Amino acid sequence: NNNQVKQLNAKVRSLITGHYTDKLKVEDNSDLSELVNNVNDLSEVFRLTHENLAQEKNRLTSILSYMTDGVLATDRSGKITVINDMAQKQLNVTREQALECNILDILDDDSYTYNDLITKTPEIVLTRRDEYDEFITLRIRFALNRRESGFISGLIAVLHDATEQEKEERERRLFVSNVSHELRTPLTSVKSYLEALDDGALTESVAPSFIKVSLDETNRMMRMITDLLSLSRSHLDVELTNFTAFMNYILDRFDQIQSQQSTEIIRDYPDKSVWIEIDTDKMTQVIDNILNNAIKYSPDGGKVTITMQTTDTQLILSISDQGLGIPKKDLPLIFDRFYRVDKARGLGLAIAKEIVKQHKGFIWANSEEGEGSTFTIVLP
Amino acid sequence: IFLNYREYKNNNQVKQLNAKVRSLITGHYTDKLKVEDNSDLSELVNNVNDLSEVFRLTHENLAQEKNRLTSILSYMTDGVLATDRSGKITVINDMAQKQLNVTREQALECNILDILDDDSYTYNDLITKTPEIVLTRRDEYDEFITLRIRFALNRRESGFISGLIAVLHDATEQEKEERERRLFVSNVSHELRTPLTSVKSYLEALDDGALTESVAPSFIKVSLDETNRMMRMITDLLSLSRIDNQTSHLDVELTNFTAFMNYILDRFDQIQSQQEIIRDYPDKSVWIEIDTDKMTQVIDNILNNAIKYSPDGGKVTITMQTTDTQLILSISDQGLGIPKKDLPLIFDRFYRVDKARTGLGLAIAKEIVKQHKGFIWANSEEGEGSTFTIVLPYE
């Protein structure tokens, strides 16, 4: 009695410090025994309601945890308040790192919390939040935490990883840029031949070949197409050919092309007869492009010097020009794949370098303003 | 005699206690009690007096968390829904109720397999956890939706498997872009290849043993004109490419559009006539910042369109007026016109009613206009004929 109060007092002090405890036994039908019964029943009742509350809260945070896409939410201000695992991985971040931070702290792309809360925007970030060169492209869409009153609790962003789709896009973008750039010169050749030859179809002293080199060129352009597609969706072939003859074919093409008619001189600096195993087509591609920008960059007429010499390291072919070529800012990048697409406005010749490397060859360049550019190709 | 009093006070304190605690068991909070300072019933009364505040504090905090989470998971942009070992939808948020045109109520009467006879089971959906795609109405008017649903493995606080978690992403616009871009590259291919296989089939006749005897000049004509078509096409394609890579940006300079137009149209009457009716309207200073190069691209292209659309009577009317917020340029021709079904389609790349000859051109025009923050569209009756209208900011 005096004791039962000590005991029950104890039980309740336990319940206070969060420590649950078994029921006390109802001794008599006393009036406080009713109180003992009531405290028992309370400890149990609130126990259930508690385990239940935590059960559902947990179910929620569980869903958010094992969820596939990334989710984060912020106060009206915009400091991160919630950020799930997935979002953490996508953004290269821990909950720790994230909670002292603000959505605007995403690559500092200069948009405002109010722009955000007004427009509930659907936009796309790009970052290397993944250690090495590996990148990730994330599409983040926003929504409001609006309460019934209209009050905005904060922001709710979902981040889908679209880092692949981005790729497939730059691949096809790439294909278009390529096919448009690479068909140019063969197309201009076929033009020049059929064009000059639209007057001079007779002159069988030239016409039989004319038609044939133009035919071979449109056939080259088709095998070109298939290649360029498969590049984002290549293949090599080789035969032994007379290389001086090669350069004379290739160069005679350009020669003809310039004879009509707007507004540069190229001199063969080989000698006569060099035999080497290569792919006619793809080598023609390489030389074609190198000559392309060689002429492109050359001011006032043209100093374009094709000088090729042979040794025991075999073929060493050089193409020299005027104008400028430096700095070492552009120099190293001009051979990298996505250059032509991701640029800021050089030329191309990545595919050139690659057709050279597939020949187990080397291809470098030196160039200085008001001196010109020299490209060099080394074949086995 | 005040011993009786003491008994009274105590028992009444205990009764008061049973009041408070019985009212706790029912989940209702009542005011603190009066301490018998200093009885030992004071200690108990005060203990319950605190216990209440405890239950309440904990419950309010936990509640706040649970509700933060709850709001986040429903007001979030994507469809979310959870299930149990069965697959029966246990959870579904706003966005998902919308994407699926259902209600939490009628939705929870559903199991996850309940879609278009999907042909997948829970027992093989938990293993693969792999995402896939459904196209469904589930939305209002003339429109249909497409959902990318990524499945995920749900679990408890213990290792055990709770059920499934599906996120549904309304990705119809994305899907649309993707599709049309694909068709774009496909087009570039077919479109360049077929002139090639054409010119190749000709030159191949001009060598296989038919070289320059009977139809030669005509084969050189065909082949030449065709390779020039491929030339122009590849030029257009380069331009569009620059536009797609956001490299091709504008260069604007405040110009008198009325004069610009006269220059351009003189230039045009020129470059045209060798082997058509051009009618001018403006006649007054219309100062507007444009990129003369690009804008000339546009106008020249639309004029050429007008031409490719006429028998010989042309009748191209350039008519351009100015409201207080816009310059309205319009190029009208009494030609064939355009099917109302091709009408919303003609500015598409490599889209042609029937060619018959490009073939982008019109696309470039639209894109440049859009670059000026303007608009352009077609109208047609098939008689009289098609007319294109461009809208540009101010003057």
Among B318, B319, B310, B296, smallest CA distance to B365 is for: B296
Give the C-alpha separation, B223 to A191, whole Å: 9
Please check whether residue A349 is in contact with residue A367, taking contact to mean a CB–CB distance below 8 angstroms.
no
| Phi, psi of B159, rounded to the nearest 5 degrees | -55, -20
Q: Indicate which of A139, A190, A197 best probes the interface with B, i.e. most B CBs within 10 Å of its own CB.
A: A190
Please check whether residue A70 is in contact with residue A158, taking contact to mean a CB–CB distance below 8 angstroms.
yes
**A358: DSSP letter:** T
Please check whether residue B167 is in contact with residue B79, taking contact to mean a CB–CB distance below 8 angstroms.
yes
Concatenated DSSP letters of B184-199: HHHHHHHHHHHHHHHH
**Chain A with chain B: Cβ pairs closer than 8 A:** 231
The length of chain B is: 395
CATH superfamily entry for domain B75-172: PAS domain (3.30.450.20)
Query: Distances in Å between the alpha carbon of A302 and those of A265, A296, A327?
Result: 5, 10, 22
Show which of residues 49-68 on chain B sit within 8 Å of chain A, judged by CB atoms. 50-51, 54-55, 58-59, 62-63, 65-66, 68
Range B248-395 has CATH code 3.30.565.10: yes
Give every CB contact of residue A104 below 8 A, 6+ residues apart in sequence: A78, A111, A112, A113
Give the C-alpha separation, A63 to B153, whole Å: 9
CA angle B246, B252, B258 (to 5 degrees): 130
| Phi, psi of A71, rounded to the nearest 5 degrees | -135, 130
Q: Tokens 């021709």 — which residue?
A: B333
Contact call for A158 and B41, based on CB within 8 A:
no
Contact call for A187 and B162, based on CB within 8 A:
no
Cβ contacts of B360-363, under 8 Å, gap ≥ 24 = B360/B233, B360/B236, B360/B237, B360/B240, B361/B236, B361/B301, B361/B304, B361/B305, B362/B301, B362/B302, B362/B305, B363/B236, B363/B240
The length of chain A is: 380
For residue B322, give the 3-state DSSP assignment.
Answer: strand
CA B8 to chain centre: 78
**A22: DSSP letter:** P
CA distance A202 to chain B (A): 7
Neighbours of A153 (CB within 10 A): 18
CATH superfamily entry for domain A1-65: HAMP domain in histidine kinase (1.10.8.500)
Give the C-alpha separation, A76 to A113, whole Å: 9
Extract the runs of DSSP E, i.e. beta strands, from B144-300. 145-155, 161-170, 253-256, 278-279, 287-290
Give the C-alpha separation, A177 to A170, whole Å: 10
Give the C-alpha separation, A331 to A327, whole Å: 6
**A24: DSSP letter:** P
CA B105 to chain centre: 31
Concatenated DSSP letters of A84-118: -HHHHHHTT--HHHHHS-BGGGSTT----HHHHHH
Please check whether residue A158 is in contact with residue B80, taking contact to mean a CB–CB distance below 8 angstroms.
no
Scored b (16 or more CB within 10 A) or e, B162-192 reads bbbbbbbbbbbebeeeeeebeebbebbbebb
Extract the runs of DSSP E, i.e. beta strands, from B116-239. 132-136, 145-155, 161-170
**B241: DSSP letter:** H
Give every CB contact of residue A256 below 8 A, 6+ residues apart in sequence: A189, A192, A193, A196
Instruction: Determine what percent of chain B falls in helix, strand and coil, rounding each to the nearest 5.
Output: 45, 20, 35
Range A234-380 has CATH code 3.30.565.10: yes
Among A326, A270, A266, A252, smallest CA distance to A294 is for: A266
Please check whether residue B163 is in contact with residue B86, taking contact to mean a CB–CB distance below 8 angstroms.
yes
Contact call for B234 and A180, based on CB within 8 A:
yes
| Phi, psi of B381, rounded to the nearest 5 degrees | -115, -5
Please check whether residue B81 is in contact with residue B169, taking contact to mean a CB–CB distance below 8 angstroms.
no
Candidate from A12, A143, A180 with C-beta closest to B238: A180
Q: Tokens 């690009």 — which residue?
A: B294
Give the end-to-end CA distance of chain B in Å, rounded to a whole number: 105
For residue A277, give the 3-state DSSP assignment.
Answer: strand
Give every CB contact of residue B277 below 8 A, 6+ residues apart in sequence: B313, B314, B315, B316
Please check whether residue A220 is in contact with residue A284, taking contact to mean a CB–CB distance below 8 angstroms.
yes
CATH superfamily entry for domain B1-74: HAMP domain in histidine kinase (1.10.8.500)
Please check whether residue B83 is in contact with residue B155, taking contact to mean a CB–CB distance below 8 angstroms.
no
CATH architecture of A66-163: 2-Layer Sandwich (3.30)
Q: Tokens 């009748």 — which residue?
A: B315
| Structure token digits, residue A99 | 């909670």
Contact call for A61 and B69, based on CB within 8 A:
yes
Contact call for B241 and A153, based on CB within 8 A:
no
Alpha helices in B245-291 (DSSP H): 257-272
Show which of residues 244-273 on chain A sit within 8 Å of chain B, judged by CB atoms. none
- CATH level 3 topology of A164-233: Helix Hairpins (1.10.287)
**B136: DSSP letter:** E
Give the C-alpha separation, A9 to A15, whole Å: 10
Contact call for B77 and A204, based on CB within 8 A:
no
**A137: DSSP letter:** E
For residue B52, give the 3-state DSSP assignment.
Answer: helix
Give the C-alpha separation, A102 to A97, whole Å: 11
| Phi, psi of A19, rounded to the nearest 5 degrees | -90, 105
Contact call for B216 and A201, based on CB within 8 A:
yes
Q: Domain residue spans in chain A?
A: 1-65, 66-163, 164-233, 234-380
Show which of residues 214-233 on chain A sit within 8 Å of chain B, judged by CB atoms. 214-215, 218-219, 221-222, 225, 229
Give the C-alpha separation, B206 to B118, whole Å: 58
Domains B173-247 and B248-395 alike in fold = no
Give the C-alpha separation, B306 to B334, whole Å: 8
Query: Distances in Å between the alpha carbon of B371 and those of A72, B10, B189, B232, B323?
Result: 35, 88, 27, 22, 21
Give the C-alpha separation, A145 to B72, whole Å: 7
Please check whether residue B95 is in contact with residue B102, taking contact to mean a CB–CB distance below 8 angstroms.
no
Contact call for A16 and B62, based on CB within 8 A:
no
Strand B278-279 versus strand B253-256 pairing type: unpaired
Candidate from B155, B188, B228 with C-beta closest to A191: B228
Residues of B in contact with A31 (CB under 8 A): 11, 14-15
Give every CB contact of residue B38 below 8 A, 6+ residues apart in sequence: none
| Structure token digits, residue B317 | 């009317």
The residue of chain B with its CA nearest to that of A183 is: B234
Please check whether residue A250 is in contact with residue A280, taking contact to mean a CB–CB distance below 8 angstroms.
no
State which amino acid sits at residue B152: A
Give the C-alpha separation, B268 to B296, whole Å: 10
Neighbours of A48 (CB within 10 A): 9
Candidate from B184, B207, B224 with C-beta closest to A211: B207
Please check whether residue B17 is in contact with residue A39, taking contact to mean a CB–CB distance below 8 angstroms.
no
CATH code linked to domain B173-247: 1.10.287.130
For residue A234, give the 3-state DSSP assignment.
Answer: coil
Please check whether residue A127 is in contact with residue A107, taking contact to mean a CB–CB distance below 8 angstroms.
yes
Neighbours of B133 (CB within 10 A): 11
Contact call for A62 and B155, based on CB within 8 A:
yes
Give the C-alpha separation, B112 to B168, whole Å: 12
Residues of A in contact with B29 (CB under 8 A): none
Please check whether residue B20 is in contact with residue A39, taking contact to mean a CB–CB distance below 8 angstroms.
no
Please check whether residue A321 is in contact with residue A372, taking contact to mean a CB–CB distance below 8 angstroms.
yes
**B391: DSSP letter:** E
CA distance B209 to chain A (A): 10
The residue of chain A with its CA nearest to that of B27 is: A46
Give the C-alpha separation, B261 to B320, whole Å: 10
Please check whether residue A281 is in contact with residue A223, taking contact to mean a CB–CB distance below 8 angstroms.
yes
Contact call for A32 and B54, based on CB within 8 A:
no
**B101: DSSP letter:** T
For this PDB entry, the determination method is: X-ray
**A343: DSSP letter:** S
Residue B62 burial by Cβ neighbours in a 10 Å radius (0-12, 13-18, 19+):
middle
Strand B278-279 versus strand B316-322 pairing type: parallel
For residue B135, give the 3-state DSSP assignment.
Answer: strand
Please check whether residue B366 is in contact with residue B236, taking contact to mean a CB–CB distance below 8 angstroms.
no
Alpha helices in chain A (DSSP H): 2-16, 33-66, 85-90, 95-99, 113-119, 163-182, 184-196, 207-230, 243-258, 280-297, 339-342, 350-357
Q: Which residue precedes each gap in chain A (C to N above 2.5 Å)?
A: 233, 263, 345
Please check whether residue A63 is in contact with residue B165, taking contact to mean a CB–CB distance below 8 angstroms.
yes
Neighbours of A28 (CB within 10 A): 9
Show which of residues 146-205 on chain B sit within 8 Å of chain A, judged by CB atoms. 150-157, 162, 165, 167, 169, 174, 178, 181-182, 184-185, 188-189, 192-193, 196-197, 199-200, 203-204
